[PDB]
């Protein structure tokens, strides 16, 4: 016989049954699931259902308090690779599954884990105490694998693939803390999870391959490898993303943002076309209409032609207006090439085509103040250069290109634009909060400036980074598809970026924000050696994402 | 005359015993052995391949006699048989597909009916084509008032309709007929004056 230190692919190890594996459960599961017809893929000699195959891995740290969850899965055919392959060509399932755990530790450590199976109706949250359920305790010095079987406890006859209903949940948490008696640098171990279908698992209805469903597919296909190291732009400017930078404290950007549910945070449908308005006053300071600065303003609520919200026109930048007066150009901000045009079937004015600074002002045309809230405000635009002709008509509008730049006087270092203390906020939004050690992340890119035309990534002074919230391919992939059931609130969908000398994990919550395990650092992480992206799955927000950089 | 039973009929009979003994189950009854008219639809020369022409859900209202008998029973279970009769002519061409869609799948333009188990219907066939829809349900029975999840029968275009003669006629009528299966039943008799909530129709 094998001496315990080598294990076969069909060897479960020890068997741990808590209280839910009963004979009547299996007898009621087999007999009732015959409403779908005769069972399919039921042959207890095939290689795909006799061996254990790889599902997952996780890490167990010394600093993990008792009662913290390390691994959770709902009951699904996605927990085994071959049933996940076979579920695209079937429309129903029933039965249970087996989970094999191998602890990669030594006989010098200490500590215990605990595993339990939760009934379908119980909410999996913060107030769940899994040590007051029937459970089983596993030592950290175990050499042979331990197998736990989760049965199918359901109130319905079978599980449709597009609508399973209520399912049980397997939870594995910390019983007692991990102890290393020598101390030092070694403070974590690893546990590997394999899976294998149970003897009473089956499929029923044949259907068509790659058929559509009433539920939702996993959000792994939108974020591929060309999105980061190639094509893919920002939400505010059409420039390729170059790097990744964290923020401390959080932010709230609500212009072109889409939730996991299909909904927008106000105006600005996601396409960099143009900015147009039909109502708004025009004026100019001074007694002479020569070499002046044009002054256009209109209240929030005058955007009748916007089909989403009436508060702002389409494609408007969500920047607070920095007040300036005189020939000195403003710092940062949003400036775009534009002109003016008059109402009542009117042609645009020839004599005034100039770059204007866009923003929201308070108390115009008197003392102009920056504003953080969009409700009860008034959109504004004023020129930075001198034009030779001014208009003073009450009906007037704008014509500004959607792509823009930043205006800076000195242009040596400045500051990444925009800041979280400058991004405006629509009514009804949830704000970013750093949970765990994970911090809100904002994508960085390269945008030209008015102070220097040649803004190349290299020498001749350090470059400036514009920051946008989410990529425009990602926003397109969420503006149509609804993901109410793809990811439960309270956790995030985590990927795994792999560089040439390290790896990091990035997340995506239900709020549409991205999380990384940066901690308290504000260093730009340049994405130049990144090769490939492999998705992982749904991970709880309390867990720490890795930051192995060389 | 042979009567067709469903593939899931033995599990369908046993799990409907939570409603009591089966009612109106007599295999020699004249309301049960013959096919009767249900509906009619149109197949046009302008229909693209893959377009849906007919869609019906599993219900005891797709038959003139199970709809009368459902006024006095609070529950039903079992399958139902469909038949298709093309008016047609010998100068036409084109085929159709019919398949049963399980619950949980969309019915829409992206549905590929030709990769389900299906039957093929010709534009100039004289004998009718028959397909059986089983009761694939996640419940023990279907209560009248709130049934649950049901399968759906979908008719689509395989090859488009062709008239080589020319003008005038450009549309064909197809008639649907229905008789119940061997495993269909009722449970739990009730007052006929009770819930009168029947698909209100602007026909009267």
């Amino acid at each position: 016989s094998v001496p315990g230190t080598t294990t076969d692919g069909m060897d479960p190890g020890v068997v741990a049954t808590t209280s839910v594996v009963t004979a009547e459960n299996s007898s009621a599961s087999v007999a009732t699931a015959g409403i779908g017809g005769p069972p399919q893929q039921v042959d207890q000699q095939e290689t795909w259902r006799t061996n254990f195959y790889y599902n997952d891995v996780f890490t167990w740290s010394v600093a993990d308090a008792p009662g913290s969850i390390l691994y959770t899965v709902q009951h699904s055919p996605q927990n085994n690779p071959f049933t996940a392959v076979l579920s695209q060509m079937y429309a129903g399932w029933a039965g249970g599954m087996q989970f094999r755990f191998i602890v990669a530790g030594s006989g010098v450590f200490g500590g215990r884990l605990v595993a339990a199976v939760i009934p379908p109706g119980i909410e999996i949250g913060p107030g769940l105490e899994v040590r007051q359920f029937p459970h089983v305790v596993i030592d950290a010095r175990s050499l042979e694998p331990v197998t736990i079987t989760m049965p199918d406890l359901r109130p319905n006859m079978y599980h449709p693939t597009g609508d399973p209903g209520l399912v049980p949940t397997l939870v594995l948490s910390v019983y007692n803390n991990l102890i290393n008696p020598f101390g030092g640098s070694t403070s974590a171990i690893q546990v590997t999870v394999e899976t294998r279908p149970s003897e009473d698992f089956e499929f029923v209805m044949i259907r068509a391959p790659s058929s559509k469903t009433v539920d939702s597919i996993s959000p792994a296909g939108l974020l591929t490898t060309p999105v980061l190291t190639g094509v893919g732009n920002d939400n505010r400017w059409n420039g390729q993303i170059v790097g990744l930078q964290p923020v401390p404290g959080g932010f709230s950007t609500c212009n072109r943002h889409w939730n996991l549910n299909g909904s927008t945070y106000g105006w600005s449908s996601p396409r960099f076309a143009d900015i147009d308005h039909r109502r708004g006053s025009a004026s100019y300071p001074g007694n002479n209409a020569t070499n002046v600065l044009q002054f256009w303003y209109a209240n929030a609520g005058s955007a009748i032609d916007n089909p989403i919200s009436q508060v702002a026109p389409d494609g408007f930048p969500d920047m607070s207006f920095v007040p300036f007066n005189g020939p000195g150009i403003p710092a940062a901000g949003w400036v775009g090439f534009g002109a003016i045009w008059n109402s009542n079937s009117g042609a645009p004015n020839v004599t005034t085509v100039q770059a204007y600074e866009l923003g929201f002002a308070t108390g115009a045309p008197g003392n102009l103040q920056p504003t953080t809230n969009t409700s009860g405000s008034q959109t504004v635009a004023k020129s930075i250069y001198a034009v030779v002709t001014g208009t003073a008509q009450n009906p007037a509008g704008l014509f500004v290109m959607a792509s823009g730049v930043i205006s800076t006087p000195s242009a040596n270092a400045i500051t990444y634009t925009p800041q979280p203390d400058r991004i405006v906020t629509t009514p009804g939004t949830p704000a970013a909060a750093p949970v765990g050690k994970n911090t809100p992340i904002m994508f960085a890119s390269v945008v030209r400036r008015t102070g220097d035309v040649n803004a190349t990534a290299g020498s001749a002074n350090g470059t400036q980074y514009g920051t946008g919230s989410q990529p425009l391919p990602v926003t397109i992939g969420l503006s149509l598809n609804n993901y109410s059931s793809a990811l439960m609130p309270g956790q995030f969908f985590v990927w795994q970026l792999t560089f040439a000398s390290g790896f990091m994990e990035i997340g995506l919550s239900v709020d549409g924000y991205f999380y990384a395990g940066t901690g308290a650092s504000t260093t730009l992480i340049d994405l130049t050696e990144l090769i490939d992206v492999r998705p992982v799955g749904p991970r709880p927000s309390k867990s720490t994402l890795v930051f192995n950089l060389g | 005359t042979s009567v067709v039973t469903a593939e899931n009929s033995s599990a369908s009979i046993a799990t409907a015993g939570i409603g009591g003994p089966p009612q109106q189950v007599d295999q020699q009854e004249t309301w049960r052995t013959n096919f009767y008219y249900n509906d009619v639809f149109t197949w046009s020369v302008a229909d693209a391949p893959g377009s849906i022409l007919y869609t019906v859900q599993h219900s005891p209202q797709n038959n003139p006699f199970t709809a009368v008998l459902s006024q006095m029973y609070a529950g039903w279970a079992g399958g139902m048989q469909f038949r298709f009769i093309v008016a047609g002519s010998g100068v036409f061409g084109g085929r159709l597909v019919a398949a049963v869609i399980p619950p949980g799948i969309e019915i829409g333009p992206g549905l590929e009916v030709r990769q389900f188990p299906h039957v093929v219907i010709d534009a100039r066939s004289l004998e009718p084509v028959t397909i059986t829809m089983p009761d694939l349900r996640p419940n023990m029975y279907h209560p009248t008032g709130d049934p649950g999840l049901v399968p759906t029968l979908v008719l689509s275009v395989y090859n488009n309709l062709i008239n080589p003669f020319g003008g005038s006629t450009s549309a064909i009528q197809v008639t649907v007929e229905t008789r119940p299966s061997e495993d269909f039943e009722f449970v739990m008799i009730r007052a006929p004056s009770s819930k009168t909530v029947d698909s209100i129709s602007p026909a009267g």
């Binding site: 007898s27 007999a31 | 033995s10 599990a11 046993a14 015993g17």
Partner: peptide
């Protein structure tokens, strides 16, 4: 309980 499985078997 036994009669249910007995009927389904028979």
């Amino acid at each position: 309980a036994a009669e249910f499985f007995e009927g389904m078997v028979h």
